[PDB]
Every structure is written in C-alpha cells, then in structure tokens.
Design a protein around this ligand. Structure first.
Ligand SMILES: [Zn+2]
Lengths: 64, 97, 63
RNA sequence: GGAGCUGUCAACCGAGCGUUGAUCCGAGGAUGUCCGAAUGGGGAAACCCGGCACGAGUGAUGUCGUGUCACCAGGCGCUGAAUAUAUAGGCGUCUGGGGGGAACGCGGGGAAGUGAAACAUCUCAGUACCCGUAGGAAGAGAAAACAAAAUGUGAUUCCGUGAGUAGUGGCGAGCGAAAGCGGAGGAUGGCUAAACCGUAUGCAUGUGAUACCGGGUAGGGGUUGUGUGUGCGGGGUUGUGGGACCUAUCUUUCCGGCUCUACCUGGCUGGAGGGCAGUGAGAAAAUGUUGUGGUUAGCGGAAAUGGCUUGGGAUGGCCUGCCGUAGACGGUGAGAGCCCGGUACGUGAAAACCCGACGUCUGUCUUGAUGGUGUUCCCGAGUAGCAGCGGGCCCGUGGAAUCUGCUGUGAAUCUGCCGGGACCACCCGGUAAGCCUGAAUACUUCCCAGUGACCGAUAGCGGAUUAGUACCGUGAGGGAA
RNA sequence: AGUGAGAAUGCAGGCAUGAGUAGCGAUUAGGCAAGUGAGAACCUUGCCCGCCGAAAGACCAAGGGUUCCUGGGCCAGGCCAGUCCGCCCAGGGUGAGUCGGGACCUAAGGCGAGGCCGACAGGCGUAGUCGAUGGACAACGGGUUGAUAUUCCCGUACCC
RNA sequence: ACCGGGGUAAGCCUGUAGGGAGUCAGAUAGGUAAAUCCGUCUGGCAUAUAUCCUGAGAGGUGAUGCAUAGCCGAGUGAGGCGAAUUCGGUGAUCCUAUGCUGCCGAGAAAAGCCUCUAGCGAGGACAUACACGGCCCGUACCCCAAACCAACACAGGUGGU
C-alpha cells in the first residue's frame, strides 16, 4: 500500500488519476478472481483500502 | 467529490456452460449492479471495452434459500446482463476464457 | 360551539344528581354565540364563535 | 499499548500483514444505499415516476452524478378581488415545528368485576385505562396565612407524630383530616400595574393666541393650543397601611448641551474617575490564562524452580524459610499471600467534555441621602359579592363556613375590601382579582463499580443453548424445548 | 426456612396395558423377459394387458417459492422395501419496443391542501391524487437447449 | 386390397357478401372569450346500384423460403436426401356483429382521436436514403393438484381458455 503521508503530497489532479487507476485495477482483479486465475487474494482488500484512502484525503483537502 | 467510473457497474462475468456457448456466438454475460438499466449498461460496456455493442438483455435472479443448523439462510439476489456485440466483433480477451 | 374563539372558554364537567342521589356525568357548556364581528371600522365582517361574556365585555365589536 | 494478528459460530483451504510498531483500547472527524416523522409526486415500508440548476457522456434522443423542490405556524418585503377605503387572498425570503422514549410530574376525561353476605346511595376509586403536555426533576411558593387574647408564629415542599382521634356514614359496609409539636432545606427571595412627570407617535380638532418652562426683563408666534389613546424612560412596590403629589433642614466629584431663545435663580441628559453585581429568580452574548481539579484508554506494584511423601498432575500431609499499607477474588492438571490476572498503595492525558479561579466584557449606582409638617389623587373589573345548578373538601346538602366550574346579576380604593365553620356586633389577622424563583422530595431506558443466611437448568427473566426465535393465528396476539 | 405428597378428571418428562392387535386413504389392474445393484412386487428398458379421453389430455390467473435441469446420496421422510423420489447436498437455469403490468385513462372506493364541524382524542369533505375487474395502444411462422423462448436465432413486419 | 401423406402465419396488395351516410350557400352567439367547428333557421340541388365510409371472407404476395410422409447410412452421438399437395361434401357455441329486428326493466367514466378558434411564429412542411435510441417489473416449475386452501403425499374446495 501507499502511505497517506505521501498521498497528501499530490494535487487533486494526480489524486483523481490515481483513484481512476485504482478503480481500473479493482475491476481487473475482480474479473481475474471470477475466472479463477488470482492467487494473491489480498490484492482486492489492499486496492479497496487504497480507494478509500484517496477519497478520504480528497474530502479532507476539500474541508480543511 | 465522487468520481463516477463505468467499471463500478460491472461486477464480474458469469462462468458456466451456457455462458460459454453464448461466448462462442459473441454474446457476453456479466453480473451488473442491481439498480442499473440497459442503456447505462450499454454505455458502460462501450466505454470499458472500446467496442460497439448491439443490444443488452437483463434478468433478475433471486437467491437460493438454504437450510442450516441455526435456521434458514438466503443467498444474495443478482441481476445479469446478456450483452451482444456488433458485427465488428473484437473479442473480450480480458474475459479470462 | 363549546369553545370560545376569543377567551378559550371550554365546557365544564360534573354530575347530574337525581332524587335517589344517582350521579351521572354531564357537561356545563358555555353560552357560545355566533357573531359576525369586524376587525377595523372598514366594515368587512368575519364569522366567529364568542361566549356571551365576551360580547358583554365588548371584546368583539359588531360593525 | 506492545508481540503477534487477519471478529465469532467453526474449523479447512488459499493468501498476507507486523520492532519502519500490527491486531487491540480511548477521543475527535470522513463516508453513511433504501425505508421509516419521511417531507419532490405516488405507494401494498424498504419501490415506482419526476421538475429545476450546475457538471459528465453520445453524431443527437436515450443515460449518469452533485444540490434543491412537502405541509403548517411566525417575522420581513411586494401586490390588494368582488369594491371605493381596504380586507381576505396571492408571491418571494428567513426562522421554527412534526416523530421516538422504561419510570417519575402536572392538567383534564374516567369504568366494572368486587364489598355491602341481595342492591340503587356508598365502596372498589379518582383505581384500570385514555387525552394534552413537559423537565432533569416537575408542581407549589413569598400571606387578602395561621392563631386566640399568648406584648404568639411568620413563603413553599417533604418526613414523623397529632390519629385510626375529632368527625363523617342506607350513622350500614366503610371513609377520615387539621391546628399544634419534632426534623430535612434554608433565599422571612425578587421584580411589575396605578397615582404623577418627560418624550415619541396614531386619531380628532384651534377665541390659531395670552395660550404652551419656575420668577423678572424681554423675542418671535407654535417646547401646536387642546383633548384622547398607545409605546418608551423615570418614579412607585406597602400592611404600625404605603405611595404620588405640596412643603422646611443638613448635604460625601469635573465638564458639556439642554428648562420655546439670552441674562441670576429650580429641573433633564452624555462623558472621566470610584463603588456594587453578572451567566443566576433578580438581563444577556461572548473572549483569554490558569487548577496534579474530574470523566473518557492504561502503567508499576513484595515474598518459595524449597525438601520428603501420595499421586497422571500438588494447590493434599509432614517439615522448612520469606512478604505483608498486599492473608479481596479468580485461574493454573486436586484446598496457592510467595506460579499467573491481580490486590494494598501509588502514577498517567495529546484531544474532547465537565467543573472551579482570575480577567477582558456587560450592567447598575453615582443630577445624590437624610431625618419632618398638613391636604387631593392611586393601590390590579365584567373582578369580588349575590343567586341557580355542580365538583372537592373529615363534612354523602346538612345550620354549611373556606376553595372551585358553567349561566345570570353585578360593587367600592383604605372610617375600602377579604378571612377568623350559618349569621350579626366588636376585636384580631391580612392586603385578592400581575408575574418569576434554588435546596430539602420522586424515578431508572442507559453506563460504571460492588453485594447477597438469593436461584443452580421442570429453578432463576419467557429467553444459560438459533429467543420474542421455531411454531400457532387473517389480525390484534400467544409463545416454547 | 421455597423444610417432608398418594390422590387436586393436578403440571412436565420417560415408559407400560390394549397389541405385534386396528389400519396402511377409493369406486382402473397389472403381467412377463432383460438390466443395474450388497439388497428389487415397487427403479430403468422392451413386449403385452387395462383405465381416462368436455379428462385423470393441453395452456393460464390467484397462490406457492427453486419444488425446474445436471451430477451425487440412501440412518430422517415416503403409511412396507427402495438402487427411486416433489426428500438431502453442490452447481446451473428465467434473455421482450410489440406478451401481462408501470412510465397512459378513469369506476366503485380510499386518502385528502385549504375548509367546515367537534371539550380533547377526532368526523366528514372540496380542489387534487390514487385505485382494474373495464377504455386506448405496435409481431407473426419456423428452429434450437439438459433446463428459456410471441423474449434467443432465421425469414418476413409493425409503432414511437 | 390395405397403410401413410394429400402442409405453411402476421403483414402488404385488392375491396366482395353484409352494414351505415345526402350535399352546397346564407344568417345567427346558444356552446364562461372567439370560432369557418357544433347546434339552430332559411334556401338551392339532389333520390342516383351515383359517391363516401366500414367491412367477414375468396384471390395474389409473404413462400427459389420453412415444414412434412418417407429413405439412407452411423453410434459418445453427429448428419444428409426428401414425393404429390388438386377437387368435393359437411360444418360451428367462432367471424361479419359495438350488425339487424323486437322489448322494457331504458342499459359507466375519463383518456385517446378528429375538428374549431384563443395563442405562438421566421422559419416551417413533405418525400427518400443512411446511421442510431427504444426504459422498469414478471418470465424457471406446479396450477382440478403428492407443489394452492384443507394440521397429512387427505375420496373435500379452486376462476378462465
Ligand atoms: Zn369568551
């Protein structure tokens, strides 16, 4: 995973692009697991927490 | 802010003999979000796979109801979309076959 | 017809005592009268319900 | 906080995280689908259909996000029908409400079984239930009170007596006070209305001049002359009656504009020291520092690997030592102060909240107090009182006082009025028809810490196990093992 | 002291007597050969016989909810046995512009802004808004799967 | 002699049996305003197998397609070929038919569609071709039954085609 501390060092633009990459990778991992070719299960959890972290920093940056 | 992504509506494919038989005929079956609609699925599929989609058909399936020691369970109900691609016919190689 | 639109007077409850001293419930209602009263000397009248005491005191003005 | 962890039934497989601090515990934030007061509209709750504004996406329609759109009440602004003044009504915008909750409060409505060995008065019982409404408590509360000749008490509430008494009762069954006396808490607390001034304004109007500030000299001719109502500011809060007027005496700061305008004499208003109060009933909204003050996680914490013996195992028996501000309670392979969690006793707060303290800040008094003398005005109105019909009081209409509901009738402002159990006279007490107020008292849905000559699985909660579950009923509802 | 049970047509649980007894749920009816299997009157296949045939055939609505198909199972259930099952386990399966409904319309009726009435709680009801069992409105034939087909595919149409 | 075939839809053409209907001109506010529309009143011309509308069905096309009686071989099972299809009789409770003729008991509403003005309007109308958009719910299975109502795999009950 990528640390929140280094997540706050980016602007809203690269934050949104990283969020888009995270969503795409989650899509691919879901399809991989459905087809049964995914050995490392924790990728799903890590990418989910990553999406959540990006949303959280975005919301905090908007607020204060 | 919320970032809307077409991929949040397509959950996973359906792996079965009927689905594979349709696959051979260029018809792909996905499990979609329960409150989607056919136009939205069409748009999302075109954006995701950069392909031209002819038509989509949807069906709702209720979850099965199983017995347990504690009592009666009930699996999750799902909605499927059976999506047919146009004559252009670029297969979905990321389907995993 | 039992509550005054001005002073909020309401019915009183009590008992009706017979000769054998049987007590049954009853109501003492207010003497509530319909008045077409005015708010200003202009002359437009509205219909309301006022008890006779409110009319006596001049709280409502017919005009 | 510190070495494992990925909740559990409940493991098995597969994958990973952690001394660069995980899982875990506390506090503050973010997200929070749809239903539900449910509120854009609809509806068979959790599911159907939208409008508007801004974005996204398509060749465009389709499609997707983010906000917003109920109703009523109250301010504010615009408009003002029949209709002229106008009003209803309409339009726009801001502020509130709606529903839930175990008990406790207050205010209303209000049974019957039952007892009376029948039954209607009466009882049950103002109970069960229902309705409206709160608050952390509520209600009541500052004498139109008691009392009885005592040169007596002195708001309210609650507790014990008084007392199963006086009484009340088809004088049947039953019901049943108060004064006084002993305590808890103490705030014998606080403001208003009126008489009179001033000012502002609404409505009427002018011997439009000898009337509008205290005298005199004077100017103009409106502090509109006058009534009247209303708001505000003074002034007044009382029972030996008090107060506004009028009236003498002594007088604890400076300056300015004002008593229609200036000049000497009496009044009103701002600013500077100084005093007194403040989150309170007596007015309210904030802002700083501080307290090893509290609450919400924790941490430390003495002393046996003792010997023999029985035993699967010692925590049993016998024999040795030690700690003790710690010999509470549990666990560990059988009765453990010395093996573990702990215990006595000490320590710990980034943050949030809760308490206090000192301040900024606010208000109020300072143009101010005093002790006196004689008269007019004021002291809460459709009220008190009276009558009719009821309720409640120990009191069931009785000679029926006090309190109170509805309908009529309907007074005075202190040599007045109300109470001292019909009523009258005299004496005594008080000063109604305005409003606020803490503590003593009642209760536990919920949270923490404890206790039991309480239960130990047909008991104890219905529920130690899938528990308001399975099952039963159309439903309200019943309800296990 | 929740202190003593033999009885209250007492309560809960376990188990006897009747008793290896009555029944085993219509008015059609089964038989043989072969097979599978540890096990066959009941399961599979074949050849016969019998029954319904305005049904005991076929297709729907209400209702039910996975009972449907494939693979497996055989201690519970099936009024016997069971290799079978509507039973148990896992996986799969329901495809619509034109069909039945909503996004169209109203009836009976329901709710009901304001509103009127009523001590309170509430009763009615206007404007509206819902409410099919009715009105309006565009698809027919053939084929395919182990399970869907006016939905998928082929041919040929229609309506916004 | 006997046995088996002796098939094929919506739609689009055409408009038959049957059923129904006069047309034009003027005036007029009664239809909340206005109307060329609807009523009403006047006239003219009309009785025509004339015209218009509706309309079962027969016929053509859809169909060089689909389907079929049969015939072949293969084997877990896959697949190919495929004849003739005319003429009559009988005959519906279905269609014309929301028709027609009788009768008294006198037999929904709103939407939709057509027309009329009020009103908007510099763009608008029609045809052809091409490329697209067609939303939400049900859809399995039983359904006179061992799958629904009946405590049961129950001699009962269950609306329609
Ligand atoms: Zn009144």
């Amino acid at each position: 995973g990528t640390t929140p501390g280094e997540l706050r060092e980016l602007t809203d633009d690269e934050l949104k692009d990283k969020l888009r990459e995270s969503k795409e990778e989650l899509f691919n991992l879901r399809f991989q697991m459905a087809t049964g070719q995914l050995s490392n299960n924790r990728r799903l959890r890590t990418v989910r927490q990553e999406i959540a972290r990006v949303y959280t920093v975005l919301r905090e940056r908007e607020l204060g | 802010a919320t970032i809307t992504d077409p991929r949040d509506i397509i959950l996973a494919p359906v792996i079965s003999e009927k689905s594979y038989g349709l696959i051979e005929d260029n018809v792909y079956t996905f499990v979609v979000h329960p409150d989607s609609n056919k136009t939205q699925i069409k748009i999302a599929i075109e954006k995701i796979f950069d392909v031209k989609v002819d038509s989509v058909n949807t069906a709702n399936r209720q979850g099965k109801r199983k017995r347990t020691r504690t009592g009666f369970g009930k699996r999750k109900s799902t909605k499927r979309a059976i999506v047919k691609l146009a004559a252009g016919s670029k297969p979905i190689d990321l389907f995993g076959a | 017809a039992a509550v005054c639109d001005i002073c909020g007077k309401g019915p009183g409850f009590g008992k009706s005592v017979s000769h054998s001293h049987r007590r049954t419930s009853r109501r003492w209602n207010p003497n509530i009268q319909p008045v077409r009263a005015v708010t200003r000397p202009g002359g437009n009248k509205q219909r309301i319900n006022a008890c006779t005491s409110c009319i006596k005191a001049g709280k409502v003005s017919r005009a």
